[PDB]
């Protein structure tokens, strides 16, 4: 069935989505979960939005990521205008035309993170670790808590994700490659990868590892 959360709206705007929900017997929750089917985003005239946690978890889940205009237009035309026509196309960081959520909604038999062990390491801001972890799981990766907990062998491909910012140490994130044998990278590798829903390649995101 239909269950929604909204992102980047004002109370008045939210009151409109609620009005929408009421009419169409659609559920409306504060927090995105397994069940959540729609993510309603604030966008500019052309369906570009800002990047928010729900934005990512939305794409990651292959949910409908639709512009707020889906709501107000349906209201205005006293009916529900199928989501296909209002889907969000891009964002203020990853380009106005990348068709992110689209590829996602479509590529659910091939998660950009098939055969990956990812370990979100150290502190993050504005995004709790377990949420980043949930994200990459939805993308098919498998989470690993400790650097030393990486599966050994060849089967899989390990990766260490850090967000340099939230650090206060000077022997911290430069020395990860000493405690394990995995590529290191910034969170950006994940978000940008999730935005485009195209498995970006570590090249541009690697961090300097002291041997």
């Amino acid at each position: 069935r239909m269950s929604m959360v909204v992102s980047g709206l004002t109370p008045e705007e939210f009151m409109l989505v609620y009005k929408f929900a009421r009419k169409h017997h659609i559920t409306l929750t504060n927090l995105i979960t397994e069940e959540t089917t729609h993510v309603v985003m604030k966008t500019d005239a052309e369906f570009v939005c800002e990047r928010t946690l729900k934005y990512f978890l939305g794409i990651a889940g292959g949910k409908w990521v639709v512009s707020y205009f889906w709501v107000t237009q349906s209201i205005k035309e006293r009916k529900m205008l199928n989501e296909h026509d209002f889907e969000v196309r891009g964002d203020v960081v990853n380009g106005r035309n990348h068709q992110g959520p689209k590829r996602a909604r479509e590529s659910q038999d091939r998660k950009i993170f098939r055969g990956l062990e990812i370990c979100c390491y150290g502190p993050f801001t504005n995004m709790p670790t377990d949420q980043l972890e949930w994200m990459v799981q939805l993308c098919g990766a498998s989470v690993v808590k400790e650097l030393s907990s990486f599966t050994l062998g060849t089967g899989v491909h390990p990766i260490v994700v850090v967000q340099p910012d939230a650090w206060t140490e000077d022997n911290g994130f430069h020395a990860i490659g000493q405690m394990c044998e995995a590529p290191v990278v910034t969170r950006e590798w994940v978000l940008t990868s999730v935005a485009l829903y195209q498995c970006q390649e570590l090249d541009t995101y690697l961090i300097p590892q002291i041997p």
Partner: peptide, 4 residues
Amino acid sequence: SPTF
């Protein structure tokens, strides 16, 4: 919400 926080943005990224």
